[PDB]
Amino acid sequence: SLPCDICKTVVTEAGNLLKDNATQEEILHYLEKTCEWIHDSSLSASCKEVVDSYLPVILDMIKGEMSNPGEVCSALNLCQ
Amino acid sequence: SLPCDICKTVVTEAGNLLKDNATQEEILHYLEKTCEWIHDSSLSASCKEVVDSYLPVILDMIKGEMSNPGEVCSALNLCQ
Amino acid sequence: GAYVLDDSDGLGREFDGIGAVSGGGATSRLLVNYPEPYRSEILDYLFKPNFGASLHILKVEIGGDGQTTDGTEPSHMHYELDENYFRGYEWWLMKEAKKRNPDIILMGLPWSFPGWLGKGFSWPYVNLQLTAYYVVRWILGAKHYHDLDIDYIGIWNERPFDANYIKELRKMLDYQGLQRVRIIASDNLWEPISSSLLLDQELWKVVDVIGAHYPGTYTVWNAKMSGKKLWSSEDFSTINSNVGAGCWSRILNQNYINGNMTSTIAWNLVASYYEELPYGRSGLMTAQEPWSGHYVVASPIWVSAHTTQFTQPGWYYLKTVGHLEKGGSYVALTDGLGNLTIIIETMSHQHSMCIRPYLPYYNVSHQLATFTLKGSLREIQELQVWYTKLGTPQQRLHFKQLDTLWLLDGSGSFTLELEEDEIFTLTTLTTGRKGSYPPPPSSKPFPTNYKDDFNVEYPLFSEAPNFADQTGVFEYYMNNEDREHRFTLRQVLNQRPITWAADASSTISVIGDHHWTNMTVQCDVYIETPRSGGVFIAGRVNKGGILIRSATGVFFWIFANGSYRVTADLGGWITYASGHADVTAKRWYTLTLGIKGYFAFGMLNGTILWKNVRVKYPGHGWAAIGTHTFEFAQFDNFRVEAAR
Amino acid sequence: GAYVLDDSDGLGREFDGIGAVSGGGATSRLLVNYPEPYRSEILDYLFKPNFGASLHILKVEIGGDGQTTDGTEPSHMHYELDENYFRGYEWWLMKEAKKRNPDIILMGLPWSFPGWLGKGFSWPYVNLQLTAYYVVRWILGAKHYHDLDIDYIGIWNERPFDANYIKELRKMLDYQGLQRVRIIASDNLWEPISSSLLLDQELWKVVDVIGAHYPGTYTVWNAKMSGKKLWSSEDFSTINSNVGAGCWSRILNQNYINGNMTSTIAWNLVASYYEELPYGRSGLMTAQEPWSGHYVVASPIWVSAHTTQFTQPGWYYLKTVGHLEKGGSYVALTDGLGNLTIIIETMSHQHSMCIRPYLPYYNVSHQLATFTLKGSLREIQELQVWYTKLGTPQQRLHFKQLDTLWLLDGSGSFTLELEEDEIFTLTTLTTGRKGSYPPPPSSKPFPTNYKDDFNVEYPLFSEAPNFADQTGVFEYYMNNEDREHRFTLRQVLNQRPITWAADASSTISVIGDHHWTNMTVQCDVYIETPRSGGVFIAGRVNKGGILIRSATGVFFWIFANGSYRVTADLGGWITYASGHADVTAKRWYTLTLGIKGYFAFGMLNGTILWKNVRVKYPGHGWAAIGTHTFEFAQFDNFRVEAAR
Ligand SMILES: *[C@@H]1O[C@H](CO)[C@@H](O[C@@H]2O[C@H](CO)[C@@H](O[C@@H]3O[C@H](CO)[C@@H](O)[C@H](O)[C@@H]3O)[C@H](O)[C@H]2NC(C)=O)[C@H](O)[C@H]1NC(C)=O
Ligand SMILES: *[C@@H]1O[C@H](CO)[C@@H](O[C@@H]2O[C@H](CO)[C@@H](O[C@@H]3O[C@H](CO)[C@@H](O)[C@H](O)[C@@H]3O)[C@H](O)[C@H]2NC(C)=O)[C@H](O)[C@H]1NC(C)=O
Ligand SMILES: *[C@@H]1O[C@H](CO)[C@@H](O[C@@H]2O[C@H](CO)[C@@H](O)[C@H](O)[C@H]2NC(C)=O)[C@H](O)[C@H]1NC(C)=O
Ligand SMILES: *[C@@H]1O[C@H](CO)[C@@H](O[C@@H]2O[C@H](CO)[C@@H](O)[C@H](O)[C@H]2NC(C)=O)[C@H](O)[C@H]1NC(C)=O
Ligand SMILES: *[C@@H]1O[C@H](CO)[C@@H](O[C@@H]2O[C@H](CO)[C@@H](O)[C@H](O)[C@H]2NC(C)=O)[C@H](O)[C@H]1NC(C)=O
Ligand SMILES: *[C@@H]1O[C@H](CO)[C@@H](O[C@@H]2O[C@H](CO)[C@@H](O)[C@H](O)[C@H]2NC(C)=O)[C@H](O)[C@H]1NC(C)=O
Ligand SMILES: *[C@@H]1O[C@H](CO)[C@@H](O)[C@H](O)[C@H]1NC(C)=O
Ligand SMILES: *[C@@H]1O[C@H](CO)[C@@H](O)[C@H](O)[C@H]1NC(C)=O
Ligand SMILES: [Ca+2]
Ligand SMILES: [Ca+2]
């Protein structure tokens, strides 16, 4: 009714956050830097490669679900 | 005021949804399965191993941010 | 066992054709600069009917300026007010394919999109109209500037679809008089597209084909139920060895048998990209040496011929298709004009594994298979026979024609002796041919002494040869206002595109021999951005494609704020040397980078800037050029001398 | 190069001690069943003062029933209403450490938590008070049952902290009369704990120490500013080779120099877990063969001694510490009683790389260092000298005492010739000692014929030896109501823990020699759950620890619904064989599994159930037992015969 309208607006904002231009690059940089913490001199490539291979697909996949706010709210039992 | 109260409850429902007992195992299975799509007979181990190593840390880390609903809403410009 | 083939109870599904993908990304990059006659010979092996692969379908990437697996592909609209229908090589390829086979089916699909389109976001569905106009304009451009009819249009390669964009796209096409253009969705998995079609009548009406990637010969219930044509819109992606050929052979038959799929499209068409880039040599054939003219007519070419030379889109599969008693499968087709084609494969598990998905063990042992022709097929008394055996060079027979079969005894029956890894094509058609051209030149490494002054007044292609862009887009550029640097190479991206892959934050184009270890790179550079601008030259660049972000070597950077830096990585996280330099924007400088063993040096206008800087060794990789961010910059008089 | 050492301008930070971790997870598993005198000798090399590593701190995992790297560790509360302070080996270890060194510092930290604390969620912050009560019960139990004073308590290992939980934990501790117990947070990165302390006065008051993991010798601005003690609460985790020893040497000095860290704690204490489990041989020493008594006093033991034998918690660092002109570093500490200790290291980059994080290149070359003792240090006339040289066998010398140094010339100055990969300890203290015990027995593989009938009436430890639980918890069990099976082994988890790692969905305990390839496993099994219950025995189990989910091998399952299954994986996705069997719940059955080359067979009560089932070969791994889910089941009369 009314929490359905607000729920939908929250999902929208959250979506718009991941959809921001800066978001992809900001996440890659965080995740590549954590690669230097997770492993040494030799295996810094494996980690970094895995990140640059799946992060786009993961992030874009999430943006996909955030794009249908009605559906999100329906699952959270705030819409139906 | 009023969208601040609803926003906070949305973050809580989603947060609690990931916090369900069944959630970890469900996600594990999904990604472990997608590993058979991504790779063949030989490299089915690498993918599966990566999954069983980092999903725990990643998932539980997100559950952390969802645990402070006020903070989430402040970033979404629905609270401050 | 006795295998019946009959058309008495009716027919199976309509066959839609076999195809291949050029794009996703820059897979055809090195083909364009092959000398004649070799370039034309390669094209014949791919597209000439009753010769080689004789492909029914050509699927191309609609360039979006982003990195899309083995490089970037140029867009028709770099900027909102920019329109150019002559960049890249996909237009040329489609025209070459169409010249050989006018009945070839054409498909277009975006992987990436230019930045401007997102209107501040890294999402293509921001303004559904603007995105649909961007795409439909390409399709109209294909006809107005190249006389090409695009038959099929996709949504967003291996990325989420928008049902409302799919609806807008139909509207847009129809409005622009392109009602004939069909829509394929969603170039990802069977779901959520299949279930979405069952729940939405309006969406069901606008989607013509369900296109799934790497399905492993199977479909899902919802897809069968949709009543739509089902295609494996992207498959293969395996090294073109005998193993790769086996994988292709098996899926060509079993995609229909197991998954009701009436079309299979291989990624990629031809391996015309540096082998050390991701998924090297994963094309139907190999053509990665334009400097030598050397090409390889790989096994998958002949595996393709077994179907493509004896079938055509519009033929129908019979209801009678299936698996063999001791392993393998058989398909059978008709044109309804009296012709019949029978394709049999016995690919062993060990010699037919694809990259995707997981293949579970199955045994293949020697067998005898008897085939009886019931119905209208019983009137056939003569069949042509074609044979292939994959394996070691000693037992390697590609597309060899065997003795004609005679079924004169009125029985309408015959038997075959079947071993492992064999293909048989039994057809009424007389048109079969194993196409042949004299052997091409021997393989040779990339030239150890190379130069490009980019002094090409009216180039045939938008970019200089052998430069493979891995982030950003580099093009031939003419500056009349300057006589000393009239013809240059320019990086033209001014913003990060709606990325398919994880593009670098700096632009970069690689060239040469990945094996090179000791080298001297020289180039004249020009920074267009005041204060903030930066450019580089590099050597020993080890990684590209989807892993371009991880790339390491020796990078020599110079910034318009009067500084320089030498890094071990494209990311610039690791510093070898740094300091001040007499460098500003809008001024031409000559950069020299020398790398030998553990040590490197750099020169500015022939004067030493830095010397004896210790670098990681051993190390090897390509030479490269680039810019600090997505910014304009020019390059001229490129030179490299190296030792492999 | 003259380096001034002086206490005239005052002192640096208070030194808090060097320690090691037992836990995270089951790292001390195989130490408990070492025969005497070897077990006691190992403990001396670790904890005996002025002997070996002479550790100042012992940090233990507070077992939570979950998989925590190399196995599971038993909780004091398996279920609500359950309390037992005698499970596992951490109580015993702490008591053994305390017997040798009564001034040892004790720390506890949870990795996992029992599932019941989650009340429906896999989250420990559902009821703050309840979770704090669980943790505080452990501290109270340590005191009440073992006379152990826990000095420090942590939050949640490498997992998010809750500010309110930390506050509630402080309240709870104080309420229970444990005001002396200090809190360390958050056993993860410098952030967000450091900034949280600056923004919240109340949180700042309750946190005594900022504990960071694998910091790479550096801290952050917010942590320095907090004014809190900074500890590298988890570091090292590298193979105990000479390279591992170099890593440890370098960080011990530079954690203080570069990051103001006054304590460093190594993961792990001693490698007493199967080497083929994750991070094998990453302890200060090695003791992974209780069956032979063979142990290795690895290099890190002596690197530890260079600091631990000549410093004590409560000493102060001087303001005068730093790096050497041509590479390496020096620290200096006093006790305020006129004693002085100087520790110098020259670890080359190539021989001191840790697993975490990335170490950037730095050069180290031959040099001379002059030290001058200003202030109250000038009055020192004499210094004892200890030396270590890491490297090749031709040049490895450990903790060798050299000729005393005299400064009688009133100069208060001395000079050293330093090469690479060297450690020097210069101290006034006379108490130094390279501890020695005769060489232990030679290494030998796990017994090829092994049996355990679990017939131990009053066991010293809660679980049978050599069984390393990888999911679930297995314990000695006594059933008086049965004479034929009075003493068994029982899986006691009835629900999945609040996991730290990705535990399997089936319980499993591994044993033996990972090299085993042909084997026969036998065990009496008992399913407690009617209808749904299931158990298994297995061979060639190739993975464990944090990778337990990935384990392959040959698994023979029986179910209480009258069925059986043979799988290639613990996950049961791959079936080798399946069918019916005369099996019900609450009945004892004898299971036999035989594996040889490409073939396997299984027996039920000595009768063949399945035979000549083709399995993957080659293959190798441990023997194992387990249950279908987190369910009760019993095992008895275990036997294995194998060929390596
Ligand atoms: C790329 O340049 C490096 C740097 O010069 C080359 O490596 C160097 O090659 C020379 C000749 O092969 C080596 O010298 C030899 O040393 C041995 C003793 O070690 C001596 O017996 C010989 O008479 C000769 O002087 C030199 O050691 C080697 N340097 C290193 C650091 O490996 C490399 O060969 C060049 N590669 C290519 C493909 O051009
Ligand atoms: C574990 O069991 C397997 C299965 O028996 C063992 O492999 C087998 O070992 C035998 C003897 O080493 C091999 O037989 C030999 O065959 C050659 C011809 O190939 C012949 O010249 C010899 O006289 C002998 O008969 C047998 O081929 C081999 N089987 C396989 C499948 O490899 C294995 O050695 C056992 N491993 C351990 C550690 O006990
Ligand atoms: C899709 O293909 C499947 C086979 O993969 C068809 O299912 C049956 O296939 C067997 C032979 O494998 C035949 O004996 C059956 O008669 C087939 N079913 C029917 C209804 O004819 C299935 O029919 C195909 N689906 C569609 C939509 O054509
Ligand atoms: C098999 O297919 C061929 C190819 O289309 C058929 O040949 C054509 O037949 C039509 C009339 O049916 C003619 O108009 C074409 O000119 C023929 N083309 C060629 C190249 O022959 C043929 O009819 C079919 N049937 C048989 C039994 O061959
Ligand atoms: C933390 O340690 C750093 C050194 O890593 C201290 O910073 C300075 O260190 C140099 C020598 O490297 C000294 O000459 C300076 O006197 C130090 N600064 C000050 C203010 O004394 C830093 O002081 C230490 N921080 C704390 C909180 O003690
Ligand atoms: C160096 O440290 C030792 C060890 O504590 C000091 O020796 C102790 O001195 C106190 C009084 O200062 C006595 O009560 C202890 O009995 C002594 N113990 C031992 C083992 O000697 C010593 O004072 C310090 N200073 C010097 C110069 O040695
Ligand atoms: C495959 O089949 C043949 C004939 O039935 C048999 O001899 C052979 O052992 C089989 N191989 C496997 C691995 O099942
Ligand atoms: C290390 O330093 C020494 C002496 O300054 C020098 O001879 C050597 O070349 C240096 N090595 C590197 C790799 O910088
Ligand atoms: Ca020029
Ligand atoms: Ca017993």
Numbering used by the authors:
A (entry chain C), B (entry chain D): 1 to 80
C (entry chain B), D (entry chain A): 25 to 668
Question: What did the published study say regarding this structure?
Answer:
Importantly, mutation of the GALC-associated saposin SapA can also cause Krabbe disease. To remedy this deficit we have solved the structure of GALC in complex with SapA, defining how saposins solubilise lipids for processing by soluble hydrolases. Here we reveal molecular details of how glycosphingolipids can be bound by SapA and presented to the active site of GALC for catabolic processing.
The structure reveals that the complex forms a 2:2 heterotetramer, composed of a central SapA dimer with two molecules of GALC binding its surface. Importantly, the active site of GALC is buried in the centre of the interaction interface. At the optimal pH of the interaction the GALC and SapA surfaces demonstrate extensive charge complementarity, explaining the observed pH dependency of the interaction. The hydrophobic acyl chains of glycosphingolipids such as GalCer can thus be shielded from the polar solvent by the SapA dimer, while the hydrophilic glycosyl head groups are presented to the GALC active site. In our structure the monomers are head-to-head, with all termini together at one end, while in the published lipoprotein disc structure the monomers adopt a head-to-tail orientation.
